Design a protein around this ligand. Structure first.
Ligand SMILES: CCCCCCCCCCCCCCCCCC(=O)OC[C@H](COP(=O)([O-])OCC(O)COP(=O)([O-])OC[C@@H](COC(=O)CCCCCCCCCCCCCCCCC)OC(=O)CCCCCCCCCCCCCCCCC)OC(=O)CCCCCCCCCCCCCCCCC
Ligand SMILES: CCCCCCCCCCCCCCCCCC(=O)OC[C@H](COP(=O)([O-])OCC(O)COP(=O)([O-])OC[C@@H](COC(=O)CCCCCCCCCCCCCCCCC)OC(=O)CCCCCCCCCCCCCCCCC)OC(=O)CCCCCCCCCCCCCCCCC
Ligand SMILES: CCCCCCCCCCCCCCCCCC(=O)OC[C@H](COP(=O)([O-])OCC(O)COP(=O)([O-])OC[C@@H](COC(=O)CCCCCCCCCCCCCCCCC)OC(=O)CCCCCCCCCCCCCCCCC)OC(=O)CCCCCCCCCCCCCCCCC
Ligand SMILES: CCCCCCCCCCCCCCCCCC(=O)OC[C@H](COP(=O)([O-])OC[C@H](O)COP(=O)([O-])OC[C@H](COC(=O)CCCCCCCCCCCCCCCCC)OC(=O)CCCCCCCCCCCCCCCCC)OC(=O)CCCCCCCCCCCCCCCCC
Ligand SMILES: CCCCCCCCCCCCCCCCCC(=O)OC[C@H](COP(=O)(O)OCCN)OC(=O)CCCCCCCCCCCCCCCCC
Ligand SMILES: CCCCCCCCCCCCCCCCCC(=O)OC[C@H](COP(=O)(O)OCCN)OC(=O)CCCCCCCCCCCCCCCCC
Ligand SMILES: CCCCCCCCCCCCCCCCCC(=O)OC[C@H](COP(=O)(O)OCCN)OC(=O)CCCCCCCCCCCCCCCCC
Ligand SMILES: CCCCCCCCCCCCCCCCCC(=O)OC[C@H](COP(=O)(O)OCCN)OC(=O)CCCCCCCCCCCCCCCCC
Lengths: 105, 347, 98, 104, 140, 96, 171, 169, 80
């Protein structure tokens, strides 16, 4: 019983808060506006069954934009290898990673 | 209660159910359930006796717990999908939480433990609202989230609902507890076929609402709340015993009555999907429901229990109660089986 | 994902299991229920500020308003229970066994 | 950061004054002074719940100085006057059904 | 407890008896812990010692049913040399029924449990043979 | 008095916003070169660190798209000292 | 996936505008009037390419034009400009309304010696048009091939063959 | 250490929930929920939700917990092994979670969680002369018309409901 | 209607002032000539950057410079 009254009458009751790519106040984009727009324009009209298999790549990019799990995993790997090399004495941090380089602008 | 305030509160109950039905946003779904609960609490406390306060407190606790689990499922959906569309859920944990929350809002087993208490505690009209109108909004959400519902979970809930609603009414003499265990068993029937064909879910929902509305309207028209007070109906208005006979033989799933239609179409759509053991156990467990229905029919219509002498004064008075749609609901709950392919209007 | 999300979810489960295990009082149950609401508020707010999704900034206020009206309704039920029985003990709410 | 330092300073000064107010009159060892449910009002609960619901309506009303900056001023002005009107309708219904009585 | 059923069913019938016996014992012990958890949930025991006594009693009862079921079925599959045969689980189900009659200290409950649990274990064996689905995946 | 003064304050707000508009291209160019400087530094240090790791691709983007993704806070300030981390990541929130 | 392609450090070297925010705020309106065209070419390239790596030459032209702007300020009107941005720099919110006489001095000397007119209220917030020579980006989101939709329905709706076909119901 | 401030406040948040969920009394349960609301407000304030954290202090702790303590005073007398045992059980489970996620920088309770501080997931841009969260809450009136209608109607109905059910007639 | 109005202004002046102030607040912005300028000031406040258009060849209403004559103007706001 999804009585779609909003499309039958042509009223916008709650479509506006539904997604991040909708019309925002003062044209503020979200942090994953482009990824969500790509996944929505992929999955539009094709149905959920075809969207589970044919829009997997855009949805994985968008989920990894939202949660940043692969990004934080990669940063964990880089930082753990860095601290391991400081522990072994095979590495020293450069002066642009120590705070003694008078930042750009 | 003030009749204007009663009408405004009933419109708020209906409005909360409509807001769950029509909205495309999860926050509006949760708002609709909040509005529904908040407005149905005074309908349960209409008479202001301690059993209604106890029933309304237990109803509040269960529906509040369910609404918080529902908003948690919505929040994990916003985590793993970044959006609010009322459709499939993008996480099996959010699907489990929302299926639990909607099973609590229905009162399906093992979250059934509020339904006979709250149904016995409140009057027959508020019990009618609780057992018919309140089943519309969670079944609408389950109709909307069925591409993500775990099959094992919903079938476990369905068979546990059918078995517990079968064994519950076998020990009962109070009519509201019998109708509540009947509700648990029939919601098990409805959600057992949800992931196979939800049109048959809507068919079972409509036929169950008609039959339950018929039985609560007969109970209000006779002012009987126990089995033993229902027994004196043959000496007061003998047509009512015929109506409760045909309606209880309908609700047991006996052909040629139209209460056979939902469970037969459910078996018809579950054997298509190569499930044979599960509709067999469902159909065999429905005999418990039919057994306590037959207990009621023996006590009411097929035999004549002894009455008292003060019934002779009630012989001199007609029923002044507004028996709203009771012949219509009676004819629809019994003689609708030749019109069985009308179920395509729910497609 | 983010580490704080684990803690807010675990706080929700703590107040869940506290709400799902009564000791004596009904007020303790309503406090666990509003702790569940508090964890929902925090977790929704951290998602919405985390994603810079502007329009859903009004969502946690609507959550707060509806569930605090729900809290007022539960406190009114508790008041009626305590006026009936003298205490807010949940073992006095036992007349619906028969 | 400066706020957290200020909050901790205010809490520390408060706790220090509480420690002085409890322990400094315990220096002068005095004599040992050995010589030797509540009634419920519904009106207290109704003024508390009326406060709570009007505070929720205030929680709806608080972004109005930010809402006046919008480009949809007909809708904003309508919903602003509508929320303050529903707060007044809540107050009128609280009046006429004897809710504001004996704590008026 | 799905992997308990996985490490039960994957082993061929009448090959490794102690492992099948411990797998069915673990399945029965888990089911007895579930029954004990609901029994101490809905019904309050009079103390902690009576509660853990009821818990251990139901757990050991269902574990003994599972143990004697798997043991009797594997020994019957060894002495009959018919591994894909439901009469082996019929004898195992009647052995578990006599076990439940020994634990509940009553003979007629044991005979009824023999009959109904033996037919139930036979039905489970035939469902393993022909591939009967109880939670059937939706296909049409 | 409030009518005249709030109309003058709106005119002053529009003047300040036009100063912001006129400055935003220079600040956007500085911000672009800022984040590209920091990412090139992080990439060269990833190359000189992640050599002992078997099967590490330096600069492998975790997104399947080849579109420019906005750099995250940990992508820029992950290898830097905690003082600069706090000054970038809570500096505006903790400012007075 | 693919290796991210960053520019070198030599692709990022440019002579910086090493002045404070109050210095930039003081000559902001003359910067918007005089440095219009390369700034708008850059912001059009920045909103169309959606990639700062595709905008480095436009940003370098922005930086060159800003440096020439402040050198053209410094040779003619350095002391009224210093008098003006010091008074802008005093205030915490850096109000323009607090410093109208130093603004009048700076705008007077700038109009008399450099011919620059400070823009009116409304002018810098106009949406202008930009004549570029670079091609329009054909796919700035790098969107791949879209999935083909499901086939629509067509044909006149004939009646159901022998009714409902529900076990024995002939209609 | 100071980069982990939202994590420290979230651990204080979980410790406070284990505190009042042990339920020694609704009085101290209300106090524990007040302290928990304060530190969760600090969690909200450290992502940039200044208005929403002041909505915690002004609405949640400002009205609703006041009404809870008001009703606890009025419907309960003025003030164990199970309470303290479940408290130390929850504290030991939460500190074991802290120890695991700080020794491995990775954990899986139900989902996988990073072990670094949550400063990593912030944006590297600005919002200009506005707050995004403030303008999204200002959008309640311009864009959120139906939401205001249903919320104001639910509050009006809530006033009606409490005046009906507390009347006792 | 004037006897009842004097009666309620004699008995309850607080409520009469309340309904009068609320009535002015309801009906008066539809009758004010300055309600249009509220909209005109709110939409002409530049919160974002005026992202320019690619000059295709036929856009005569869009200027090429801020000091060009064509485009939206705020002389009405300077004057009022
Ligand atoms: C479409 C779905 C419709 C759903 C039902 C809507 C009506 C019921 C709900 C509200 C209600 O109770 O209204 C009173 C209700 C009577 O119900 P009741 O009080 O329980 O009946 C007891 C006596 O009949 C009361 O008798 P009385 O002495 O008070 O006055 C006699 C009264 C006098 O009537 C009037 O005065 C009406 C004149 C004004 C009409 C409106 C003008 C505006 O006539 C009747 O009541 C005759 C019976 C009316 C029909 C009842 C059943 C309605 C349809 C139910 C669904 C059928 C579905 C079948 C599907 C089968 C296959 C699946 O309806 C009316 O009085 C008006 C009937 C209008 C029928 C319209 C049919 C086409 C609709 C399209
Ligand atoms: C594989 C692991 C995973 C499988 C799934 C999980 C396991 C659950 C299986 C299905 C559910 C079975 C029933 C569980 C609860 C038991 C009832 C109970 O609380 O009784 C206490 C209590 C009775 O106490 P009472 O009234 O004081 O009187 C009894 C006397 O005090 C003194 O009486 P007493 O000393 O003689 O003992 C009383 C008690 C003690 O019961 C026992 O000692 C029997 C223990 C089990 C014996 C048979 C074990 C067989 C194991 C399988 C075979 C092993 C090998 C397998 C190889 C592969 C297959 C061939 O017996 C009963 O209560 C019998 C009636 C209940 C039917 C039990 C059916 C067991 C099926 C097991 C399937 C496995 O009853 C209640 O509290 C009734 C109200 C609650 C009803 C609702 C219960 C819902 C349970 C839901 C479970 C599933 C959750 C689904 C989650 C997903 C959806 C949300
Ligand atoms: C199932 C297996 C039986 C387990 C339940 C036994 C009854 C309850 C009990 O233990 O009561 C004792 C005890 C207290 O009862 P009591 O005081 O003795 O009351 C009995 C009277 O004293 C009366 O004195 P009594 O004890 O001497 O008489 C009792 C009588 C003992 O009967 C006799 O002594 C004479 C008759 C001999 C035995 C019955 C033979 C029937 C043969 C099968 C039917 C014909 C098949 C024909 C096949 C032809 C081709 C070969 O046994 C029964 O009536 C039990 C019948 C079977 C119960 C389950 C029926 C399922 C029907 C499903 C639809 C079909 O109950 C409790 O404490 C409650 C909880 C008990 C512990 C849990 C029970 C084990 C559950 C295991 C899991 C089962 C899952 C479901 C599988 C099957 C359905 C799919
Ligand atoms: C130019 C303009 C003018 C043109 C004028 C043309 C017409 C002139 C005559 C005017 C009157 C027309 C009447 C309707 C047309 C004939 C329908 C018919 O006979 O269908 C045969 C129909 C199928 O047989 P057929 O040989 O394949 O078809 C011959 C024709 O081709 C049949 O045609 P078909 O193939 O197109 O039929 C379609 C389909 C063919 O049927 C099927 O596909 C099979 C499925 C039918 C339903 C089966 C449900 C089974 C489970 C529930 C059982 C309920 C309990 C049974 C009764 C209990 C007592 C009430 O029909 C249905 O499914 C409709 C549902 C059943 C209703 C039948 C019509 C009743 C009208 C009068 C109602 C009075 C109350 C009657 C009793 C209530 C129960 C029927 O027979 C049955 O289903 C047997 C049941 C009894 C039918 C009712 C007989 C109608 C006349 C009754 C007069 C006596 C009433 C006594 C007082 C009240 C009772 C105490
Ligand atoms: C095997 C060990 C099982 C230990 C847990 C069950 C112990 C139990 O039944 O405790 C009884 C308790 C009711 O409290 P009670 O002791 O009656 O109150 C006296 C006041 N001090 O009951 C309770 O506290 C109810 C909840 C107990 C835990 C149930 C779930 C875990 C145990 C079953 C699965 C293992
Ligand atoms: C066998 C046997 O000894 O059964 C006795 C038992 C009751 O045991 P009791 O003698 O009380 O010690 O009795 C029982 O346990 C009940 C009956 C046991 C099973 C009997 C099976 C045959 C019944 C007749 C079938 C006719 C067809
Ligand atoms: C009266 C009641 C009669 C019940 C009859 C049930 C018939 C068995 C149906 C389930 C079954 O055992 O199916 C066989 C299946 C093992 O075969 P297969 O399908 O290859 O397993 C791989 C699964 N991915 O195994 C499975 O699918 C899992 C095993 C299910 C075992 C069910 C009984 C467990 C104990 C009672 C609870
Ligand atoms: C349409 C405009 C907007 C309306 C909605 C917004 C209102 C904003 C103010 C909020 C008011 C909230 C509370 C309102 C409650 C009204 C009911 C009421 O108070 O009735 C009781 C009162 C008599 O008081 P009593 O019962 O004796 O109490 C003892 C105190 N001495 O009864 C009375 O005193 C009679 C009160 C009604 C008559 C007041 C008439 C004022 C007319 C002013 C000029 C016209 C203003 C334009 C609007 C049209 C008004 C009809």
């Amino acid at each position: 019983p999804f009585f779609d009254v909003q499309k039958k009458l042509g009223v916008d009751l709650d479509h506006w808060m539904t997604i991040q790519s909708a019309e925002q106040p003062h044209r503020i984009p979200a942090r994953c506006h482009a990824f969500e727009k790509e996944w929505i324009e992929c999955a539009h009209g094709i149905g959920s069954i075809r969207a589970e298999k044919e829009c997997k790549i855009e949805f994985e990019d968008f989920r990894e934009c939202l949660l940043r799990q692969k990004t934080m995993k990669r940063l964990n790997a880089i930082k753990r290898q860095r601290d391991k090399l400081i522990k072994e004495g095979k590495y020293t941090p450069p002066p642009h990673h120590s705070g003694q380089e008078d930042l750009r602008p | 209660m003030n009749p204007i305030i009663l009408i405004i509160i009933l419109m708020t109950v209906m409005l909360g159910t409509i807001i769950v039905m029509i909205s495309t946003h999860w926050l509006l779904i949760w708002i609709g359930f909040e509005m529904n609960m908040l407005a149905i609490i005074p309908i349960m406390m209409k008479k202001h006796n301690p059993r209604a306060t106890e029933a309304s407190t237990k109803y509040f606790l269960t529906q509040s717990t369910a609404s918080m689990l529902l908003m948690m499922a919505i929040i994990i959906n916003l985590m793993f999908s970044g959006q609010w569309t009322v459709m499939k859920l993008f996480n099996p944990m959010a699907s489990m939480l929302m299926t639990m929350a909607l099973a609590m809002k229905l009162g399906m087993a093992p979250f059934h433990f509020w339904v006979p208490e709250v149904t016995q505690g409140i009057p027959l009209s508020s019990g009618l609202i609780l057992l018919t109108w309140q089943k519309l909004a969670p079944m609408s959400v389950l109709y909307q989230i069925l591409p993500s519902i775990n099959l094992d979970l919903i079938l476990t809930l369905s068979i546990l609902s059918i078995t517990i609603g079968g064994w519950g009414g076998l020990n009962q003499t109070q009519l509201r507890k019998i109708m509540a265990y009947s509700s648990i068993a029939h919601m098990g029937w409805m959600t057992a076929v949800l992931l196979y064909n939800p049109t048959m879910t809507l068919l079972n929902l409509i036929i169950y609402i008609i039959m339950t509305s018929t039985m609560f309207t007969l109970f209000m028209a006779n002012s009987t709340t126990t089995t033993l007070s229902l027994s004196h109906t043959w000496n007061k208005a003998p047509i009512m015993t015929i109506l409760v006979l045909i309606t209880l033989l309908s609700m047991g799933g006996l052909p040629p009555l139209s209460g056979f239609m939902p469970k037969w179409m459910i078996i018809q759509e579950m054997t298509k999907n190569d499930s044979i053991i599960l509709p067999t156990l469902m159909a065999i467990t429905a005999l418990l429901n039919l057994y306590f229905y037959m207990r009621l029919t023996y006590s009411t219509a097929l035999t004549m229990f002894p009455s008292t002498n003060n019934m002779k004064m009630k012989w001199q008075f007609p029923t002044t109660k507004r028996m709203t749609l009771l012949p219509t609901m009676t004819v629809l709950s019994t003689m609708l089986l030749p019109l069985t392919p009308i179920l395509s209007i729910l497609e | 994902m983010s580490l704080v999300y684990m803690n807010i979810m675990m706080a929700f489960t703590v107040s869940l299991t506290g709400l799902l295990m009564y000791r004596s009082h009904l007020m303790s149950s309503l406090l666990c229920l509003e702790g569940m609401m508090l964890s929902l508020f925090i977790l929704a707010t951290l998602m919405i500020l985390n994603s810079h999704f502007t329009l859903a900034s009004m969502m946690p206020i609507i959550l707060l308003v509806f569930a605090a009206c729900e809290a007022a309704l539960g406190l009114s039920l508790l008041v009626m229970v305590s006026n009936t029985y003298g205490t807010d003990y949940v073992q006095n709410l036992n007349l619906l066994q028969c | 950061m400066n706020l957290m330092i200020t909050l901790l300073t205010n809490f520390t000064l408060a706790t220090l004054l509480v420690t002085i107010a409890f322990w400094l009159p315990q220096l002068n060892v005095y004599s040992e002074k050995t010589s030797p449910r509540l009634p419920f009002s519904m009106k207290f609960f109704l003024v508390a719940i009326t406060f709570l619901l009007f505070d929720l309506e205030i929680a709806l009303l608080l972004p109005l100085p930010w809402a006046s900056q919008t480009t949809n001023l007909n809708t904003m002005l309508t919903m602003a006057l509508l929320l303050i009107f529903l707060l007044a309708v809540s107050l009128a219904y609280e009046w006429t059904q004897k809710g504001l009585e004996w704590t008026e | 407890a799905k992997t308990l059923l996985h490490q039960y069913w994957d082993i061929p019938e009448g090959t490794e008896c102690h492992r099948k016996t411990y797998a069915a014992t673990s399945i029965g012990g888990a089911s007895g812990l579930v029954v004990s958890a609901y029994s101490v949930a809905l019904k309050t025991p009079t103390s902690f010692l009576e509660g853990v006594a009821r818990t251990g009693r139901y757990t050991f009862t269902a574990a003994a049913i599972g143990a004697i079921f798997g043991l009797t079925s594997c020994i019957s599959a060894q002495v009959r040399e018919k591994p894909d045969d439901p009469l082996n689980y019929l004898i195992g189900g009647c052995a578990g029924g006599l076990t439940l009659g020994a634990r509940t200290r009553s003979y007629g409950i044991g005979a009824a449990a023999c009959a109904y649990m033996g037919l139930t274990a036979a039905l489970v064996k035939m469902g393993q043979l022909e591939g009967w689905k109880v939670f059937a995946e939706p296909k049409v | 008095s409030m009518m005249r003064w709030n109309r003058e304050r709106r005119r002053l707000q529009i003047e300040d916003f036009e100063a912001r508009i006129a400055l935003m291209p220079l600040l956007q160019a500085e911000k672009d070169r800022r984040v590209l400087q920091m990412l090139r530094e992080n990439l060269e240090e990833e190359a000189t660190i992640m050599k002992d790791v078997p099967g590490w691709k330096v600069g492998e983007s975790v997104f399947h798209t080849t579109r420019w993704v906005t750099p995250m806070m940990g992508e820029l300030y992950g290898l830097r000292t905690g003082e600069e981390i706090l000054s970038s990541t809570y500096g505006f929130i903790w400012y007075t | 996936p693919g290796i991210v392609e960053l520019p070198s450090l030599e692709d990022l070297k440019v002579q910086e505008v090493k002045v404070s925010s109050s210095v930039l705020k003081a000559a902001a309106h003359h910067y918007g009037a005089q440095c219009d065209k390369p700034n708008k070419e850059f912001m059009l390239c920045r909103w169309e390419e959606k990639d700062p790596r595709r905008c480095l030459e436009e940003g370098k032209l922005v930086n060159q034009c800003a440096l020439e702007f402040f050198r053209q300020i410094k040779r003619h009107c350095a002391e009224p400009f210093t008098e003006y941005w010091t008074c802008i720099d005093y205030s915490g919110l850096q109000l323009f309304r607090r410093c109208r006489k130093e603004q009048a001095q700076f705008d007077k000397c700038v109009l008399d010696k450099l011919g620059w007119v400070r823009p009116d209220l409304g002018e810098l917030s106009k949406v202008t048009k930009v004549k570029t020579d670079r091609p329009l980006p054909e796919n700035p989101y790098h969107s791949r091939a879209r999935p083909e939709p499901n086939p629509e329905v067509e044909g006149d709706l004939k009646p159901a063959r022998h009714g409902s076909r529900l076990f024995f119901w002939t209609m | 250490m100071m980069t982990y401030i939202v994590f420290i406040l979230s651990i204080i948040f979980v410790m406070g929930f284990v505190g009042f969920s042990s339920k020694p009394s609704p009085i101290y349960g209300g106090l524990g929920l007040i302290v928990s609301g304060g530190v969760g407000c600090g969690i909200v304030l450290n992502f940039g939700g200044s208005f929403l954290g002041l909505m915690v202090f002004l609405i949640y702790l400002g009205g609703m917990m006041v009404v809870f303590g008001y009703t606890t005073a009025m419907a309960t007398e003025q003030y164990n092994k199970v309470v303290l045992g479940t408290f130390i059980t929850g504290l030991l489970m939460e500190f074991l979670m802290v120890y695991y996620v700080l020794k491995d920088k990775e954990v899986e309770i139900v989902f996988k969680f990073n072990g670094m501080g949550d400063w990593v997931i912030y944006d590297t841009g600005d919002s200009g002369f506005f707050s995004e969260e403030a303008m999204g809450i200002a959008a309640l009136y311009s864009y959120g018309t139906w939401l205001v209608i249903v919320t104001g109607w639910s509050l009006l109905i809530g006033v009606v409901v409490i005046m009906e059910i507390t009347r006792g007639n | 209607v004037a006897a009842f109005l004097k009666n309620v202004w004699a008995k309850e002046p607080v409520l009469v002032a309340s309904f009068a102030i609320a009535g002015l607040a309801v009906i008066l912005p539809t009758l004010s000539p300055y309600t249009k300028y509220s909209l005109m000031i709110n939409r002409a406040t530049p919160y974002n950057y005026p992202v320019p258009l690619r000059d295709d060849g036929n856009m005569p209403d869009v200027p090429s410079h801020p000091q060009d004559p064509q485009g939206p103007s705020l002389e009405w706001l300077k004057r009022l």
